[PDB]
DNA sequence: GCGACGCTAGCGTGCGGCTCGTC
DNA sequence: GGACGAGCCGCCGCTAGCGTCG
C-alpha cells in the first residue's frame, strides 16, 4: 500500500514530511503544494516533478533518518506558478497552514485548503473574462448534461435524447473540464469517441443523484456539486438551477459553429464573436456569448433587444458615455461570488469601491429607469475605510484609512510616539556622548540599536551594551531602549490584529450586498452588450433587421470577410424555396452561403446586420454541409443524413457541393435526390453545386442564382455579383489553362469537351 | 535609439547599464542577454519583451539618476529559455562577464540556422540557407555544427523551392534583389514559413555569380554568429539533375520526412540508426535517391553484408548505441568551444572505438586514437563538470604543478580544522566554529551561550542572530595563503584543461574520419536490421517494373496489410474501384518502394525488379491547404502542369483522381487529355480515377486494374486486393445508404441512376 | 533505567535588506 | 567621498544534539 516518500536513507520519516505524505496520498491525481512557512514545497518525486516542470532548483531536506529531495516556490508567486502548472495539465492541491504559528502545538496544522482544477477556478488571475464551465454527463432515461461556473454560480442542465444532441449542446458551451458518469468511463468504446471529439481534461466524481427530476440530470448535477464542493473547500455559491430546454432556441449544431467560425477559426483568423464583441465589461462579454450560443426564436424579445440597440445607435453621446464609464467597471458578478464565498481580498474590495462609484454617473446619463440598485451606502463606507490604493494582504501595510477605527487610531497613535522615541534618543545620545555622528538604527536581527563608528570607539560610555560588530561600526544597547522596543512590537502586533478585523468587518458589510451586487451586474451587463452591439453597428454599417416569412436581403456582407477585404455586397430573396447557386469556382458561392447564415444568426441574436435592408424569418435552426466513415464522400453523407433528419420547413439549410466524392453518376443522383428532399421539406435551402442538371430539375419552388467570370486581357477575372439565373458554362479547362497546363493538353481537352457536346 | 534606455530619470546611464547599452547597440536585430552575477538580464524596452514572451517578473534597475525596467533568467536555465525564445522567432546575443569594470562582451549569437549548442540541435542536420540571383538561382546551404557546405544553381524558381524544401532550412538569407521584390517575398513567406535574416552578399570564391554571392552571405553571416573563423569542410557544388527528382509535392504526398499529421513517416519507419552522423547520412540518401546502378548495387551489397553477418550486425549495433556525435564534437573542438563535459563524452567514445575495430577489422580504416584516449583517461575526472566552476576537472596525479598547489591548499584547510579542534580544547567550547566568508575571509564562530567563555585573544568582526564570528592574530597569514592558492589552482587547472583540450583538437580529422566511417556502418547495419525485422527484399533493376506482393512500408507497421502485385513498363495503368478499398495506398506503396530501392535499401515485398526512375512525381491529393482564394481544382492543375513539364519516359508518375473539383465534363475532358499526354510521354503512370471513360481509351500502352468490395453482413466490406482489369460499378448510393441516408432518398437515387441507363 | 520535556544552534526554495569595498 | 556594484545572512519552522528531571 501507499504511505512512503522517495529518496535515500534509512530510519523513520520526519514529523513534517510525515504530515506531507499523509495529505499527499489523499489526493492521488493532484500535485500537492505543501505550505511550509513563506513557501509551497514538494518532496520526493513530486519535488522532482516540480523542479523540472517549472525549471526550479532541486535541493533536499535532510534529517537523522534520511534525506529527501525538495522543491519550493515563494507564496508571493503562487498564482503565477499555479497558472503555468495548470496549463500543463496538473490539478493542484493547496495545503496551507490553517492555525497561526504563534499558537501551535509544535507542528503547525496543515490541511488542503482548496483544489485547483481547470474548470473550478475562482482565482481571478486564473480565469478568462469568458464563462468557465465544469460539465457533467450521465445516463439513465436519456442523456444527462449539466454545467456549473464555479466563479459566477451559474448552474444549469438539460436532458437530450441522442448522443448527437449531447455533443452539440456540450460543444456550444466549450466546457473546460468534464465529469463522466461511471457507465461512460467504463465503456471503452464511448470514452474513445468522447476523448477524441472533446480533448478536454477528464475527472472522476461521484454521480449520486441530487435533488429532483430526470434520473440522469440528478446524477450529473450531484456530480458537479460533489466535485466543486471538494475543490472550493466549503459550500458553494450557487444560483437557482435551470433545467432548460434547447428546443426553445435556434439550433446551432457543432458543424455549423465550426464551419461558420462563430467562436473558433479555421485559419487562425477572426471569428464571428471576435468581430462582433466590443463589450467593455466581462459579464457583458459573457452575456453576448450566451446570446450567440442560443439565438432566440421569438420575434417579440428580439424586437425588444433591437430597440435598445437602436437606442444607443441614435444616442451617440449617451452610447459613448456609458461605454466610457464601463471601462472602469469590474466583474461585480464574480466579485459578489468571491464575497459570498468569503474569499474577497482587499484588492477585491478596492475594486468594488471603484465600480460602485460609477453607478451614480450611469444613473444620471441613462435616467432612474435603469433600475440600478442603490449601493451608495456600501460605496461610501468603503471610501471611508479603505486607502486610496488597497494593498494585497492585510497583515502587511496599511489597509484601513486613518480615522475609521477608534481602536486602531489609538494604535497608530501609540506607534507614532513610540517610534519618535528612538528618534529623540538619537539626539539625546549624540549630546551626552559628544559623538556627532552617532546613529540610532534598526534591523530584524538585533532590533533598535545605537550606532557608533571606529574613530569614536574609545569614546563610548560604559553603559552601552555591545550587540553587533561591523568592519568599522559597533552597535550598542541601553536598557531604556530594550523596553521601548518591546512597546513598539506589541503595538505593531496589535495594529495588525485590528486592521485585519476592521477589514473582515467591512468585508462582511459588502457580503450582505452580494445579491444587490449581482443584480447591478446583470443590468450593467445588458447595458454593456446593448451599447457594444450599437458600437459595432455604427462602426461597420449594420442595419436593423425586420422579421417576417420572406427573406429579402439587400447588399449583403459576410460580417467577418469584409473585415479584411473590399467585399462586394449581394442580394437574396428566398421563401421556403430551393436556391441552387452555380458558377465558376473562386467566384463567390460559399462566401455567399456562409454570408446568409451569419446574417440570420446575428438577427436572431438581437444584433444589427451587415446589409442595406434585411427582412428575415425566425429560423428554428441553421444547418450546414460546408468545407470539412473512412472516405470523404461517406463523411459528407453522414452529415446530409443528420441535416435531413432535423431540418424543418423553418430551417435555413446550406449545402456546398453535396454529391462530390464519388462517380459522376452517383453524384448527380444523390444530389438530385437530396435537393428534392429538402425541397419537399420546404426549408430555406441554399445549394451550391457543379451539377448544372440540378438547376434544370422539374421543381416548383426551385430558384437559380450564379456567380460569374469574364475571360479578359490576362485570363479570367472573377467578379462577385451573385446574379439571377443559372451559370451558363463551366470554366474548368479555362482555369486549368490559367494554372499552367500545357497548351496542347488544354487544346485537346477543349476538343474533347466540344466532341462530347455534339452528343 | 543608441545610448537611450527606456526608463525614467535624467542623469547618465550608470557604469553598468552604460556597458549594457553599448553592446545592446552593436547587435540591433538581436535580443541582448546581459550577464549579471548568476543571471542573464535585459533592460529598458527589451526587458519588457523578455518579460512578455516568457511571462517573467518585471521589476526595476535603479540608480540615483535613472531607473529602468529589468527582467531576467537564471544563468543556469539559459539553454532552456533560449529554446523557447528561439522558437518564438527571437535572435539572441549573449554577453558574458569575462572571467574576473567586469568587462562584459558578446560571447555567442544564438540563431535558428547557426546553432552550435548540442542541447538546442536535433540529431538531424541544421542548415542556414542563402538564395541569390544571376543567371538562375543561387542556393547554398551551411550547417555550422558540422561544417557541411554545399550549393547548386537552379534554372527555375520552381526547382529552387524544391531544393530548398528537400533540405528544410532553419533560417534563410535572401539576397537584396529578392527582399525588395515585393511579390517574391510575399510568396516566399507564404510558401516557406521560416525565419528570414539580412546579410551581405558580396561574392566569395569561384563559379557562378549567384553562387559565390550566396556562398558569401553564408560565410559572412555565420562568422558573425560563431564570432570568428568558421570550421567548414570543402564547399560541395552539386547538381540536382544527377539524382532522382523528389519535388516538394512528392515529398509531402509520400510523407518521406514529415507526416500529414497522424504520425509515422517513411523516415521514422526506416530510420533505425544508432548515431547522429548515421541518421544524417541516411537522411542525406533519402533526400537524393540515385540514378546510377553501380553505386546503388554497391550499397545493396553492403546492406546484404549485414543481412548475412547477423553476429556482426548485432555486434556493431550494440557498440554504437548512444555513441557520441564525433562530427559535431570535432567541430566544437575546432571552433574552440568544446566543454570539459565534451572531452568527457569524447573519451567514452574513444574507449568504445577499439571494440568496434576488433569486430570489423583493418578493412574498415578507423583511425587509432588510443593515444588521445590514454591522455583523456589520464587527465579528466570520471565525470568532468563544464558547469561546476572549471575545478574538480583535472584528476590528481596528472599534472605535478597543479598537484603541488592542491596539496598545499589542502594543508591550509587542515590547519583551519586544527585551530578548531585545538581551540575548543582550551576554551571548553566544543561548539566554536572555524568557517570562512568572502567579506573577511576566515574566522571563528561562537554561539550566543558561550560569550562568557570567549577569551580576549579574539577580536569580534561580525555578530549574527544566534552567534558571533571572531578573529585572531595567527590567522590572517594562513588565510591570505589559502586564497593565493585557490586562485592559482584555478589559473593552473585551466591551463592544463586548455592544454588537454588542444591535444584533442589536433585529432579533429581523425575524429571526422572515424565519425564518417561509423556513419556508413551504422547506416548499412540499420538498413539491414530493418530488412530482417519487417521482411524487406533486395531489389533488382531493369527496364520493367515487377513487384511481387509489395506492401506500403509505413502503413503496414500499423495494421494487417494485404500485399499486392504490379507489372508496369512505360504503360498508362488506370486504377478504378470503390473508395475505401485501397487505390491511393497502392499508388503510394508503389512510389515508396521505388524510393527505398534507389536509396539503396531493401524493399517491402517478395520480389522487386525496378527501373531506375529519374523522378517520382505525385499528385496524391490534399489540395486547398493555404486554403485561400485558389480553388482546390486550380491548385491541383498547377501540380499537374508541373508533372507534364517534368515527367520523361523514365519518370514514375502517380495521378490520384486528377480531374475532380469541377464540372463533370471539363473533369473527364481534362482527365483524358492528361492521361493521353502521359501515355505519349511513355512514363510509368499510375492513374487512380473515377472516370471509367479513361478505362476505355483504347491506347496501345493503356492497362486496367481495380479493387473491389463485397456485400457482407449488413452493408459493404472492402477487401484490399488489387485485381486486374477495370471495375464496373460505383458504390456511391450504396455508401450513402450505409451513411444513413433516408431509404426514400436512397431509393430515389437508384431510380435516377438506372433511369440514366436508358440513355 | 531511560522515556519526556526544554533550550537552541542551523539549514534553505527564492529573494529583500543589510554590509562592505572602492573612486 | 556619497554612490555604485557585488555578495552574505536570514526569513518561518522544524530538528538534532545535549543536559537533565528523579
Ligand atoms: N462578394 C465577395 N466580395 C469580396 N470577396 C469575395 C466575395 N465572394 C467571395 N469572395 C472571396 O473570393 C474567394 C472565393 O470565394 P468562395 O466563396 O470560396 O468561392 P467559391 O465556392 O465560389 O469558390 C474567397 O477568398 C472569398 O473570401
Ligand atoms: N493494401 C492494403 N492493405 C491493408 N489496408 C489497406 C490497403 N490499401 C488500403 N488500405 C486501407 O484501406 C483504407 C482506404 O484506402 P485508400 O488508399 O485511402 O483508398 P481509396 O482511394 O481507395 O479510397 C485505408 O484505411 C487504408 O489504410
Ligand atoms: F468554396 Be466554393 F464552394 F468552391
Ligand atoms: F485515397 Be483514395 F483516392 F480515396
PDB file of C-alpha atoms and ligand atoms in Angstrom, chain A residues 583-591 593-594 626-627 655-657 660 688-690, chain B residues 628-629 631-632 661, ligand 3:
ATOM      1  CA  UNK A 583     -20.864  29.452 -61.330  1.00  0.00           C
ATOM      2  CA  UNK A 584     -17.059  29.184 -61.577  1.00  0.00           C
ATOM      3  CA  UNK A 585     -15.005  28.411 -58.502  1.00  0.00           C
ATOM      4  CA  UNK A 586     -13.178  31.340 -56.885  1.00  0.00           C
ATOM      5  CA  UNK A 587     -16.323  33.303 -57.818  1.00  0.00           C
ATOM      6  CA  UNK A 588     -18.101  33.551 -54.579  1.00  0.00           C
ATOM      7  CA  UNK A 589     -20.668  30.911 -53.771  1.00  0.00           C
ATOM      8  CA  UNK A 590     -19.665  29.808 -50.413  1.00  0.00           C
ATOM      9  CA  UNK A 591     -18.601  33.243 -49.294  1.00  0.00           C
ATOM     10  CA  UNK A 593     -23.860  30.678 -48.401  1.00  0.00           C
ATOM     11  CA  UNK A 594     -21.874  31.455 -45.271  1.00  0.00           C
ATOM     12  CA  UNK A 626     -19.626  23.130 -45.792  1.00  0.00           C
ATOM     13  CA  UNK A 627     -15.880  22.503 -46.032  1.00  0.00           C
ATOM     14  CA  UNK A 655     -25.299  22.825 -48.924  1.00  0.00           C
ATOM     15  CA  UNK A 656     -21.896  23.173 -50.516  1.00  0.00           C
ATOM     16  CA  UNK A 657     -21.102  20.745 -53.347  1.00  0.00           C
ATOM     17  CA  UNK A 660     -18.804  15.250 -54.790  1.00  0.00           C
ATOM     18  CA  UNK A 688     -24.007  25.454 -54.246  1.00  0.00           C
ATOM     19  CA  UNK A 689     -23.304  22.861 -56.886  1.00  0.00           C
ATOM     20  CA  UNK A 690     -21.408  21.964 -60.058  1.00  0.00           C
TER      21      UNK A 690
ATOM     22  CA  UNK B 628      -7.246  30.865 -49.792  1.00  0.00           C
ATOM     23  CA  UNK B 629      -8.670  32.286 -52.992  1.00  0.00           C
ATOM     24  CA  UNK B 631      -9.999  26.674 -55.734  1.00  0.00           C
ATOM     25  CA  UNK B 632      -8.737  23.182 -54.957  1.00  0.00           C
ATOM     26  CA  UNK B 661     -13.032  19.728 -58.384  1.00  0.00           C
TER      27      UNK B 661
HETATM   28  F1  LIG E   3     -15.792  27.310 -51.967  1.00  0.00           F
HETATM   29 BE1  LIG E   3     -16.762  27.088 -53.116  1.00  0.00          BE
HETATM   30  F2  LIG E   3     -17.934  26.084 -52.815  1.00  0.00           F
HETATM   31  F3  LIG E   3     -15.885  26.431 -54.285  1.00  0.00           F
END
